[PDB]
Amino acid sequence: DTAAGHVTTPCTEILFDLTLAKHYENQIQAAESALNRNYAAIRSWTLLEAMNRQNAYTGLIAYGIQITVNAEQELQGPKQTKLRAAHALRHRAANLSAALQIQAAQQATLTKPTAGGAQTPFSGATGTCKYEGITATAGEQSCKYSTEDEEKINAAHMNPEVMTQITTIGDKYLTTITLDAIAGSKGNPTQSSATYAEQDCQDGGNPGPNFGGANALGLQVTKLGTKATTEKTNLYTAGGTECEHQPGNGPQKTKQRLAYLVCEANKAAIITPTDLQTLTLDALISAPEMAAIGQLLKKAYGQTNEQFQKNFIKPQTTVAALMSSPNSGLALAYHK
Amino acid sequence: DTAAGHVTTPCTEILFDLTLAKHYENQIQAAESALNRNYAAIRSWTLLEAMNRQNAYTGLIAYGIQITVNAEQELQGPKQTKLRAAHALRHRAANLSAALQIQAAQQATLTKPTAGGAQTPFSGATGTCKYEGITATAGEQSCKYSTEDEEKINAAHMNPEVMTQITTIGDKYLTTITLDAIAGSKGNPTQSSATYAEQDCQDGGNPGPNFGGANALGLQVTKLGTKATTEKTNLYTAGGTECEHQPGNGPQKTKQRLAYLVCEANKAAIITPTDLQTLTLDALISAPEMAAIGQLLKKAYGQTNEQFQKNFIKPQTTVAALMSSPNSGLALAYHK
Ligand SMILES: *[C@@H]1O[C@H](CO)[C@@H](O[C@@H]2O[C@H](CO)[C@@H](O[C@@H]3O[C@H](CO[C@H]4O[C@H](CO)[C@@H](O)[C@H](O)[C@@H]4O)[C@@H](O)[C@H](O[C@H]4O[C@H](CO)[C@@H](O)[C@H](O)[C@@H]4O)[C@@H]3O)[C@H](O)[C@H]2NC(C)=O)[C@H](O)[C@H]1NC(C)=O
Ligand SMILES: *[C@@H]1O[C@H](CO)[C@@H](O[C@@H]2O[C@H](CO)[C@@H](O[C@@H]3O[C@H](CO[C@H]4O[C@H](CO)[C@@H](O)[C@H](O)[C@@H]4O)[C@@H](O)[C@H](O[C@H]4O[C@H](CO)[C@@H](O)[C@H](O)[C@@H]4O)[C@@H]3O)[C@H](O)[C@H]2NC(C)=O)[C@H](O)[C@H]1NC(C)=O
């Protein structure tokens, strides 16, 4: 758990969450790229069949259609499982970034108070100093990662075999405002302490800084901000086979839902089919589907790969760009 | 601007943002569904050609390859533009939901204070009452929409022709903590006012509720929470043709970036190709690509649609399920 072991702060959880989402997204993108390459190969061989050789080209088209349509169908499930996780991880990272900005508002700006006597919620006070609209805001926050952060929290460290837990920021960071506050009194503050120059309530003597007047009353919000904590959540049950935190068994925390989805995404294996455009002879001969489609296989495609390449892989003004161009169909219709 | 005119609260902005994202996502899903239907048709006709008729089936394959590969290529740009907007709108909705939860923390829980005399930041006070770790939290928040909310804020009201502005919650809701606070004093509170039963600082007489003791000093955070406001941002320039809020011209607010992306997504038109599985004769005859691929067209496909359907659309044990099954390639190899 190199990557998750490096999550110790809101910023580094954000980086883990975004980096794992993109990892799942790249896995799907890679598989879909492989499919489109295979469909471009089939279109390429379709034009060549239109130009013994015909049956051989059709053996490739049939083999290509079979394994590519199979893998496209086999992909949809793992695709959805992985995407559900990538969406939730990006959603969580968005959440954490928003809470980060708010928890950065740690300095308060006081308003002009208003002095009074007894009033809610100090019915027994002889003096009160009431503030409305005290605010706290921070400049735009940004996470700045070190070189090691991005080396540790990296798709290279997110293979399923090495992942057993996630680390998340505790919920209080996303739900709770925390602050320190202090009241100060001097003399006999009342409703007549209506000199507000120092953003407190003063009267008597010479009002001024540091409770200069005879009677003073005020407060300050000296600090705001909720401390982040971290929490570990395992992906698998004790035995290590099943995903923990299955939904449908009672209320769950965010970390539990995320851990379930990441576990299922890690287990959703993608079957990548053979790359048709770099296919070798021994790959086609050894392919089990080519038994039903077809020593005889060699007779038709070649007994050396150097031959199979030259006849079926290397071609020719281009077969591949044409059959994925605005003139793909006209090219096949003319030659047919 | 029926949908955006209905955004008046954080919850309804969230609904607009999520509803417009899904609209863009459905537009892409629809186009990709149309493509896969067309590729399944081409695979279907490929098997039938393997079973004059051959040239006619090949005319459909060529026409199908041409218009489907064209539309797949034409889709990639509008796809990326729309997805960039759907991602940012979902990211914004996540943001707003997190701020909503925090701005819902409007009731403070006071801590046991500590009494003192003069101390930072009241060096001139004779009495202070210091609180640490005052917190405010709310139960889990949820947006509950009315029937009209979902009728007004609806993909049916998000056609580009009717959209000219977006409405967003102002930034203070996502960045600023706001609170009211009041101090109360009675008598001569000092460092000896160390009776904290009422979560204030009391001594003298009979300390107790409502400043029962002779000397008292305390504060309360009576309310927290930042009021949401709304802001309008237009999508287009004054002339109405160009997208406003182009990036690269200086710092921008979130509403401006969103408005730019929504404008570009609204303008990114998707060219949907002809549905091959429901193709009519007059559609194929009138298709301009069929001129180069091909009165002669009718001779081969039929002079009535009822004929074109029976020969080329309606087929047969199924041609379509087979050519998208694990046995698609074996089906073509055997018949070829
Ligand atoms: C959802 O909510 C989150 C959290 O609030 C928002 O996240 C913030 O998004 C903004 C906008 O992208 C981020 O601001 C950007 O930060 C980039 C990094 O800046 C730092 O590092 C560079 C060096 O690489 C320093 O130069 C810089 O001073 C910072 O230290 C900047 O590169 C971006 O700059 C561009 O835009 C600004 C506009 O203010 C211009 O002034 C610049 O010239 C430049 O054009 C920008 O500043 C911010 O960091 C994010 N915060 C966090 C905590 O992640 C999401 O945007 C929001 N999403 C939506 C869609 O609502
Ligand atoms: C990013 O940050 C946001 C904002 O904080 C989080 O959004 C919250 O997400 C949770 C979890 O999905 C939401 O809670 C859910 O609300 C659903 C709607 O509940 C209301 O309406 C139903 C009737 O339809 C009432 O019965 C109910 O009382 C509410 O009035 C509930 O259906 C969900 O319930 C399920 O889970 C809970 C767990 O607490 C169980 O108790 C239930 O029995 C049930 O199994 C759930 O309560 C919450 O509303 C969202 N808040 C907002 C403001 O949107 C994101 O989750 C977070 N994302 C990530 C990935 O981190």
Do B98 and B113 have their domain in common? no
Of B32, B59, B31, give the one whose Cα is nearest residue B45. Answer: B59
Question: What distance in Å separates the CA atoms of residue B61 and residue B49, rounded to the nearest whole number?
Answer: 9
Name every protein residue with a CB atom under 6 angstroms from any ligand 1 atom: A 94, 97-98, 100-101, 140-143; B 88, 91-92, 95, 251, 254
Between CA A313 and CA A233 the distance in angstroms is 49
- Half-sphere exposure in the Cβ direction for A26 (13 Å, CA): 11
Best residue of B38, B46, B74, B182 to probe chain A, by most A CBs closer than 10 Å: B182
- Does residue A69 fall inside a structural domain? yes
C-alpha angle with apex B227: B221 to B231, nearest 5 degrees? Answer: 160
Looking at the structure, do residues B214 and B315 belong to the same domain, yes or no?
A: no
Omega within 30 of 0 (cis) for the link into B121: yes
Q: If you measure from the C-alpha of residue A142 to the centroid of ligand 1, how many angstroms do you get, rounded to a whole number?
A: 6
Instruction: Count Cα atoms within 13 angstroms, Cβ side, for B96.
Output: 27
DSSP conformation letters of A289-304: HHHHH--HHHHHH-SS
Q: Tokens for B133?
A: 């770790």
Please, which residues have CB within 8 angstroms of residue A328's CB and are 6 or more apart in sequence? A43, A47, A322, B62, B65, B66, B69
Tell me the HSE value of B194 on the side-chain side, using a 13 A CA sphere.
4
Give residue for tokens 């379709």: A46
Task: Please state the three-class secondary structure of chain B as a single string.
Answer: CHHHHCCCCHHHHHHHHHHHHHHHHHHHHHHHHHHHHHHHHHHHHHHHHCCCHHHHHHHHHHHHHHHHHHHHHHHHHHHHHHHHHHHHHHHHHHHHHHHHHHHCCCCEECCCCEEECCECCECCCCEEEEEEEEEEECCCCCCCCCHHHHHHCCHHHCCHHHCCEEEEECCHHHHCEEEEEEEEEECCCCCCCCECCCCCEEEEECCCCCCCEEEEEEEEEEEECCCCCEEEEECECCCCCCECCCCCCCCCCHHHHHHHHHHHHHHCCCCCCCCHHHCCHHHHHHCCHHHHHCCHHHHHHCCCHHHHHHHHHCCCCCHHHHCCCCCHHHHHHHHC
Last residue of a domain, one of B171, B196, B231: B231
| B93 shares its domain with B115 | no
Whether residue B326 contacts residue A70, with contact meaning beta carbons closer than 8 Å, is answered with yes
A192 within some domain: yes
Nearest residue to A48 (alpha-carbon basis) of A278, A323, A302, A293: A323
Shared-domain flag, residues A26 and A78:
yes
User: What Å distances lie between residue B125 and A183, B180, B275, B314, CA to CA?
Assistant: 9, 22, 83, 93
Residues A217 and A120 in one domain: yes
Q: Are residues B117 and B224 both part of a single domain?
A: yes
The residue among A162, A193, A224 that closes a domain is A224
Task: Quote the minimal CA–CA distance from B156 to chain A in Å.
Answer: 25
d(C-alpha A50, C-alpha A333), whole Å: 9
Measured in angstroms, the CA of A126 and the nearest CA of chain B are apart by: 5
Q: Compute the Cα dihedral for B93, B98, B101, B107 and give only its sign.
A: negative
Interface test with B, best of A45, A58, A219, A332 (most B CBs within 10 A): A219
- Assigned domain for A169 exists: no
Which member of B46, B67, B328 has the closest CB to residue A66?
B328
For residue A172, what is the nearest residue in chain B, using CA coordinates?
A: B137
Q: Tokens representing B59? A: 């005319």
Residue A245 lies in a domain: yes
Residue A61 lies in a domain: yes
Is the domain of A56 the same as that of A72?
yes
Residue B180, Cα to own-chain centre: how many angstroms? 34
Q: Which of B114, B112, B113, B111 is nearest to B136 (CA)?
A: B111
Residues B72 and B134 in one domain: no
Q: How was this structure determined?
A: X-ray
Residue B192 and residue B296 in one domain: no
Q: Best substitution site from A95, A96, A253, A256 to test ligand 2's pocket, by max atoms within 8 Å of Cβ? A: A95
| Class of residue B132 by CB neighbours under 10 A (exposed 0-12, middle 13-18, buried 19+) | middle
Q: Is the CB of A88 under 6 A from ligand 2?
A: yes
Containing domain of residue A11, as a range?
A: 2-103+236-335
Q: Considering B182, B208, B231, which residue would you say is the last residue of a domain?
A: B231
Answer yes or no: do A175 and B105 touch at CB < 8 A.
yes
Q: Is residue A143 in a domain? A: no
Instruction: Let me know whether B252 and B326 are in one domain.
Output: yes
* Residues B307, B286: Cα–Cα separation, whole Å: 17
Whether residue B256 sits in one domain with residue B221: no
The domain tally of chain B equals 2
| Nearest C-alpha in B relative to A212 | B124
Task: Classify residue A247: in a domain, yes or no.
Answer: yes
Tell me the residues of chain A between 222 and 261 that have a Cβ less than 8 Å away from chain B: 222, 224, 226
A24: enclosing H helix or E strand: helix A10-49
Contact A97 B102 (CB under 8 A): no
Find chain A residues with C-beta within 8 A of B284's C-beta: none
Q: Are A190 and A127 in contact (CB under 8 A)?
A: yes
Strands (E), A66-126: 108-109, 114-116
